[PDB]
Amino acid sequence: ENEEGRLIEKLLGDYDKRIIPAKTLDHIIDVTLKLTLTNLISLNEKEEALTTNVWIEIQWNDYRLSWNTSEYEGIDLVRIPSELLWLPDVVLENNVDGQFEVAYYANVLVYNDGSMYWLPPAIYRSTCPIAVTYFPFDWQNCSLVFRSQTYNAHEVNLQLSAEEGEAVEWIHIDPEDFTENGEWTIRHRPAKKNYN
Amino acid sequence: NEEERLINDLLIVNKYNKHVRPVKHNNEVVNIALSLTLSNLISLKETDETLTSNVWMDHAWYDHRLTWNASEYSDISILRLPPELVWIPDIVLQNNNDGQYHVAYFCNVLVRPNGYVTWLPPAIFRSSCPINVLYFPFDWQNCSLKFTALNYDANEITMDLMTDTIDGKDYPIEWIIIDPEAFTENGEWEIIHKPAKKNI
Amino acid sequence: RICFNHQSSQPQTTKTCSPGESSCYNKQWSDFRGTIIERGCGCPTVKPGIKLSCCESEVCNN
Amino acid sequence: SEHETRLVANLLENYNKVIRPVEHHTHFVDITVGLQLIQLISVDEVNQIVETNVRLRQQWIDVRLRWNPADYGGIKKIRLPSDDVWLPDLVLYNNADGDFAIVHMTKLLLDYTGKIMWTPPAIFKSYCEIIVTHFPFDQQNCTMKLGIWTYDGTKVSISPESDRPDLSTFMESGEWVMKDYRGWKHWVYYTCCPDTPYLDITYHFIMQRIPLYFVVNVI
Amino acid sequence: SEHETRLVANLLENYNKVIRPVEHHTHFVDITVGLQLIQLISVDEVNQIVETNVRLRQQWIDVRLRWNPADYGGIKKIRLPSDDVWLPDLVLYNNADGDFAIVHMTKLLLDYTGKIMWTPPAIFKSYCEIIVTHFPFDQQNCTMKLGIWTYDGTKVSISPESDRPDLSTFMESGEWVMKDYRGWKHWVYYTCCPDTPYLDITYHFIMQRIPLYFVVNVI
Amino acid sequence: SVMEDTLLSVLFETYNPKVRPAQTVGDKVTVRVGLTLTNLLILNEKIEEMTTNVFLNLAWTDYRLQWDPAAYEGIKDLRIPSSDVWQPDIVLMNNNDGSFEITLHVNVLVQHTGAVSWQPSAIYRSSCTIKVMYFPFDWQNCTMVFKSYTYDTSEVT
Ligand SMILES: *[C@@H]1O[C@H](CO)[C@@H](O[C@@H]2O[C@H](CO)[C@@H](O[C@@H]3O[C@H](CO[C@H]4O[C@H](CO[C@H]5O[C@H](CO)[C@@H](O)[C@H](O)[C@@H]5O[C@H]5O[C@H](CO)[C@@H](O)[C@H](O)[C@@H]5O)[C@@H](O)[C@H](O[C@H]5O[C@H](CO)[C@@H](O)[C@H](O)[C@@H]5O)[C@@H]4O)[C@@H](O)[C@H](O[C@H]4O[C@H](CO)[C@@H](O)[C@H](O)[C@@H]4O[C@H]4O[C@H](CO)[C@@H](O)[C@H](O)[C@@H]4O)[C@@H]3O)[C@H](O)[C@H]2NC(C)=O)[C@H](O)[C@H]1NC(C)=O
Ligand SMILES: *[C@@H]1O[C@H](CO)[C@@H](O[C@@H]2O[C@H](CO)[C@@H](O[C@@H]3O[C@H](CO[C@H]4O[C@H](CO[C@H]5O[C@H](CO)[C@@H](O)[C@H](O)[C@@H]5O[C@H]5O[C@H](CO)[C@@H](O)[C@H](O)[C@@H]5O)[C@@H](O)[C@H](O[C@H]5O[C@H](CO)[C@@H](O)[C@H](O)[C@@H]5O)[C@@H]4O)[C@@H](O)[C@H](O[C@H]4O[C@H](CO)[C@@H](O)[C@H](O)[C@@H]4O[C@H]4O[C@H](CO)[C@@H](O)[C@H](O)[C@@H]4O)[C@@H]3O)[C@H](O)[C@H]2NC(C)=O)[C@H](O)[C@H]1NC(C)=O
Numbered sequence A: 001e002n003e004e005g006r007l008i009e010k011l012l013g014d015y016d017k018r019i020i021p022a023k024t025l026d027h028i029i030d031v032t033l034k035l036t037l038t039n040l041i042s043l044n045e046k047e048e049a050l051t052t053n054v055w056i057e058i059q060w061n062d063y064r065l066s067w068n069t070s071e072y073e074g075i076d077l078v079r080i081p082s083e084l085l086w087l088p089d090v091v092l093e094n095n096v097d098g099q100f101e102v103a104y105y106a107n108v109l110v111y112n113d114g115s116m117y118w119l120p121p122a123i124y125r126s127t128c129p130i131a132v133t134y135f136p137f138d139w140q141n142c143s144l145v146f147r148s149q150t151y152n153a154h155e156v157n158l159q160l161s162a163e164e165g166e167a168v169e170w171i172h173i174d175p176e177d178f179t180e181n182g183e184w185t186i187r188h189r190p191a192k193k194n195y196n
Numbered sequence B: 001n002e003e004e005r006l007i008n009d010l011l012i013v014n015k016y017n018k019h020v021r022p023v024k025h026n027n028e029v030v031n032i033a034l035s036l037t038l039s040n041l042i043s044l045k046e047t048d049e050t051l052t053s054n055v056w057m058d059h060a061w062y063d064h065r066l067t068w069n070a071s072e073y074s075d076i077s078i079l080r081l082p083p084e085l086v087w088i089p090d091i092v093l094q095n096n097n098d099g100q101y102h103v104a105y106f107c108n109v110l111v112r113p114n115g116y117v118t119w120l121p122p123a124i125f126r127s128s129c130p131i132n133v134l135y136f137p138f139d140w141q142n143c144s145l146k147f148t149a150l151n152y153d154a155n156e157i158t159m160d161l162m163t164d165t166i167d168g169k170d171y172p173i174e175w176i177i178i179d180p181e182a183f184t185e186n187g188e189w190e191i192i193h194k195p196a197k198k199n200i
Numbered sequence C: 001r002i003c004f005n006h007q008s009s010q011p012q013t014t015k016t017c018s019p020g021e022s023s024c025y026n027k028q029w030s031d032f033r034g035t036i037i038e039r040g041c042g043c044p045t046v047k048p049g050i051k052l053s054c055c056e057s058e059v060c061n062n
Numbered sequence D, E: 001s002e003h004e005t006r007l008v009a010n011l012l013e014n015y016n017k018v019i020r021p022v023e024h025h026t027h028f029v030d031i032t033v034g035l036q037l038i039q040l041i042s043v044d045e046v047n048q049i050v051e052t053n054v055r056l057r058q059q060w061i062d063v064r065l066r067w068n069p070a071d072y073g074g075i076k077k078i079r080l081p082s083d084d085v086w087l088p089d090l091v092l093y094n095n096a097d098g099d100f101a102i103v104h105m106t107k108l109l110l111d112y113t114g115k116i117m118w119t120p121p122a123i124f125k126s127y128c129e130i131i132v133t134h135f136p137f138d139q140q141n142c143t144m145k146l147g148i149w150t151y152d153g154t155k156v157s158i159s160p161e162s163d164r165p166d167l168s169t170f171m172e173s174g175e176w177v178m179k180d181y182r183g184w185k186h187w188v189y190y191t192c193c194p195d196t197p198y199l200d201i202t203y204h205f206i207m208q209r210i211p212l213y214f215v216v217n218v219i
Numbered sequence F: 001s002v003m004e005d006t007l008l009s010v011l012f013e014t015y016n017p018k019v020r021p022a023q024t025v026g027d028k029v030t031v032r033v034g035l036t037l038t039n040l041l042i043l044n045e046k047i048e049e050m051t052t053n054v055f056l057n058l059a060w061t062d063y064r065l066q067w068d069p070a071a072y073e074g075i076k077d078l079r080i081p082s083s084d085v086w087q088p089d090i091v092l093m094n095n096n097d098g099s100f101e102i103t104l105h106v107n108v109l110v111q112h113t114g115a116v117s118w119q120p121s122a123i124y125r126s127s128c129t130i131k132v133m134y135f136p137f138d139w140q141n142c143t144m145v146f147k148s149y150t151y152d153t154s155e156v157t
């Protein structure tokens, strides 16, 4: 018998995925995201659209999905399909098509303390206006804007990821496995939190 | 609101089944009257041989199970119901070029106390129209939208053309309907004739 | 001629290089999941994101 | 803890999303409509189609969806999915080849008084009379006609939220300049039904073309 | 049919498709993976994308799906739908702009021992680097990296079915010749986790172009 | 009709559309596969594809959908939504996109003997190899392969 069945049927019983997991009234959910570029597919200059394949890593804490390992023989990590849980509604806002969401709804890794690690892959078609003055000797500055589609700053706090104490203020690119585009060379890949 | 009580008596109490024809005996036919309104003509691409059009199909039939007495439920004389709760006639475009046989927006149906049901769903249709090129660029084309009922045979469902009234008299609507005030003409095609026909 | 050929934090293991090889390397890089160390024989060419080291001694690529 | 779970369970227990939010069937529900233009994606002058990225702001009251914060720990707002409650069927009447209604069923905001604010995104593809007499120095007047599809003005009333569309977050185009924009509400009566009005809000946008690509490439 | 009816009702009564098929959480589930190439659809040298028609054969045991043929009139195999049981989340890591996972949920074969054989179809769009130095006399090496997305090699193990893809029913191309093909399984350890391996099978296809169209049309 | 509702409730009381109708363990089901061509749309030569509008004509017997018409006031046939009965997984195996299955899920016609006739419609895109030696004075030989994706010879004939 996979103890994981007992455990998951204990967790998802009496669980409403429509309800934000705010512990108290003025509790903001710290949602930490990080981006990983897999391929730069194209940059259509006639439609001013950037196509990319990204793996976005999203972390947050759900106080309802915590347990004590001694009662479950030491299991400290479990995999639950994303469509059964409460998710922050992190979307790409500057899309040209109507694709706000991710492509593959992967499982979520849930730890005994309520930590949630979700790494869904996505195919996005962003909008970036082209500067044509120097075409074909030009360089372009194209942005990917991520927001919550449902919650405000009194509900969730979007932040960038911090590995080993130092923030990750850049797009992550695997130096060994990354295949260069064919027409475009990536010079800079910064990231920042903005406010309107 | 008394609509909640009416709609619950009609659908839940009376155990309404939406996969059964609206008839008292299995040997009768359901007459469905049909009309078509052209909202706008998008294109007639000569290389693909495809007419693209925006039309609003208009159904009308009778369901003896969707009847009530207005006096006993306040004085409700009209009701709106989602098409996924009542039986609806499935009329499909048979000469489409893509895999779109159905209407695009499944809007509500309206029901009156006698059981008369009306349904006007809008649709975008891409249909096969062979091009006569003999006189291009001074050609005129004859495109057709053929509609069939593939869920029941002619002994169970009868298709007809809808009727109007001028001075107490009935006449059938033998044409496509076009609002003369909200119609923007196409940049390349002007409509000359727009008949309608029930074919056996 | 004798190098370490284990990866990351695996228990230590060695290999004997081909005759005429005198070096030992140590590649380190990070992917989406973590850090990988590749130890072997020789001194190869690496892409401009990898921390490559080479040593001409013996078992000196850890 | 469990206060907002108890609240949503007690609000949707005996709710029916098929009936209009009215106390009596003779009254109507008032819906405040507003349009936010975000980007002008394209203008097809041949097929006569304008493509826009918009948000359709919609406000209305549901007097059965209300609670008392004191009995639910002080909650005054919640986020509910839009498929759980009654929604108005707003359709783009002058649609060309896109979607008539809303298809992104995004969550909505609900206050303890029953006031609802729903703001879903949409790609509008509208039909537009394109005049090409003065191309490439031509001005276009393009409209988006909106209305309730299955209800008349005695059951569901609509009213614009402001006299002019919202262009505060509008992305500059590159081919078109926005000169003026305004929304108007209309009442339409038919001879068959003396006192039944049919309502629609029509937003219009006056767009001037930037004539440089066509001066350098054709003239 | 009657016996099978009763059997399927007794097999899906208390089954949960969310939990892995293992007797103890410390064991892993072994999945024998195999790839059948059926057609080479396209090679985009600009976007660097290869489109193929494949079959993803997958075998594994589910120890909760077993019965005794004597108690069901001698039945030894059935065809359950695939949405009814636990499945492995095999993803194409080097996907470019297609589907990451399987989307055609075809039925699977189940014998009385619990052994499962599922063989769904798929269109693979892989990101393949295109060296163009020798075009139109160029040879390409295109890969297809497959792995379990959310599990490590201690929970879900994969192993190739044969040393090289199955091209027995391969439709000849017209523009490309298959020279060689092989599959390799890799074990990856990270510095953080000393004894947790991450597994992947990578299939490669060495493709030689037929340079007749471009010699007669360009050269 | 009350008698039709009664008949449907009787038929689909324990009916499972997942199980293949084999009255005895070992029996095979006989499926008749026909095709009606409505329009040959295109034979694109740049992708080696052929698009057709067609009706499949399938027929089989389900011993479970039987009844005596005299006990139901003379009802001899029934039009039932296709998703409620068991159907063989007849698909186009040589399609060029990834669309194996049909498009329009019309109702099935079930007779009191258990004879099930299903005539669904589809816009199929099949792959055929083009012989490019006498183009444009060429003739092509394009095929459409139709078999069950799941069941094999030991199960259906
Ligand atoms: C780009 O393209 C655009 C689209 O083509 C184009 O847009 C058009 O712009 C023009 C302006 O330039 C718009 O014209 C305006 O439209 C307004 C709205 O009209 C509708 O509503 C009227 C009001 O209806 C209420 O009141 C009636 C009684 O007065 C009742 O009978 C109604 O039942 C209704 O009552 C309800 O509300 C009452 C008060 O709210 C309330 O008491 C009552 O109980 C109930 O709740 C309708 O009368 C009107 O119907 C008329 O017009 C239609 C055709 O549109 C006819 O078919 C009808 O038969 C009928 O005649 C509409 O349904 C108008 O209000 C506004 O009119 C005022 O201004 C004009 C100027 O010419 C005057 O002639 C008119 O008398 C009005 O006078 C106003 O004067 C000043 C303000 O100027 C003010 O002091 C005074 O009090 C009064 O308000 C005007 O016509 C047009 O609608 C747009 N068309 C669209 C959107 O499609 C745009 O211009 C283009 N841009 C370019 C080219 O640059
Ligand atoms: C077109 O493009 C293609 C893609 O780019 C390209 O494909 C590449 O082809 C080459 C072949 O030409 C492939 O190279 C081979 O890969 C094999 C698999 O490598 C992986 O697995 C190894 C084995 O891992 C097990 O064993 C280890 C100990 O030996 C353990 O530490 C592991 O934990 C693991 O143990 C598990 O399995 C054991 C047995 O199964 C079991 O006992 C144990 O309990 C447990 O279950 C790994 O070692 C290896 O990792 C190495 O490489 C990576 C980088 O790739 C480094 O980061 C690591 O640090 C590490 O060094 C992989 O994960 C190899 O087995 C095979 O090696 C043999 O041959 C090479 C030849 O150079 C020898 O150097 C090597 O010693 C081996 O020799 C033995 O076999 C050969 C015959 O095969 C023979 O000489 C003799 O018998 C000898 O004993 C080889 O390297 C390459 O992987 C492909 N890349 C892909 C698919 O991405 C293709 O070539 C291109 N085509 C063209 C251009 O024409």
Ligand SMILES: *[C@@H]1O[C@H](CO)[C@@H](O)[C@H](O)[C@H]1NC(C)=O
Pocket: A068, A069, A070, A071
């Ligand atoms: C976890 O459960 C064990 C019983 O198996 C108990 O002894 C221990 O105190 C529990 N831990 C906490 C933090 O409650």
Ligand SMILES: *[C@@H]1O[C@H](CO)[C@@H](O)[C@H](O)[C@H]1NC(C)=O
Pocket: B069, B070, B071, B072
């Ligand atoms: C409708 O109900 C009223 C109230 O009882 C009754 O007087 C009237 O006769 C009814 N009408 C019909 C047609 O039954």
